[PDB]
Every structure is written in C-alpha cells, then in structure tokens.
Amino acid sequence: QLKSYYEESRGLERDLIGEFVKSRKTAWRVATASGLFGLLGMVCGI
Amino acid sequence: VGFSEVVDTYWLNQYVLNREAYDYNT
C-alpha cells in the first residue's frame, strides 16, 4: 500500500541513518530554544 | 507573571494674587 510514486522515490533516495542524525540534531536545537525561553523567564522574574 | 512647574506656578500665583487682591495704596 505504497500508494505514491513520490513516496517510493523519497524512500529510495532518503538515507535512514542521516535522517536519524538530523532528527536528533533538531531535537537538541529545540531543547536549546526551550532553555533560552527558560532563561528569559528567569531574567524577567529577577 | 512576576514581571508585574516651578517657574509657571510662580507666575500663576503672582498673577492671581495681584489680579484678585485690592488695596487703594498699592
């Protein structure tokens, strides 16, 4: 049930391990942004 | 959440006092 030429093409071209590396990099970046918001809250409180 | 005249008054005084006051002599 692939149901998509585009899905099959992307599945062929996509690199799984690199995809996981990029996903974790994005996760850490978002966590860093969260830490930034937290520090901003700390400064605003002070 | 946690984040939350000197000069003019003289003239106005002298104006009112002199305007409103009265003494035949001054």
The SS3 assignment for A35 reads helix
Closest C-alpha to A44, from B4, B19, B6: B4
Q: Is B3 on the interface with A (CB under 8 A)?
A: yes
Please tell me the distance from the alpha carbon of residue B8 to that of residue B21, in angstroms, as a whole number: 20
Tokens at B3, concatenated: 């984040």
**A12 contacts A18 by C-beta, under 8 angstroms:** no
Other beta carbons less than 10 A from residue A41's beta carbon: 13
Distance between CA atoms of residues A28 and A35, nearest Å: 10
Both tokens of residue A14?
């996509």
Amino acid at A45: G
B4 at A interface, C-beta within 8 A: no
Q: Does B2 touch chain A (CB under 8 A)?
A: yes
Contact criterion met (CB below 8 Å) for A44 and B2 = yes
Which DSSP symbol is given to A1? -
Number of CB pairs, chain A paired with chain B, less than 8 A apart:
4
Give residues with Cβ within 8 angstroms of B3, minimum separation 6: A44, A45
Resolution in Å, one decimal place? 7.6
Technique of determination: cryo-EM
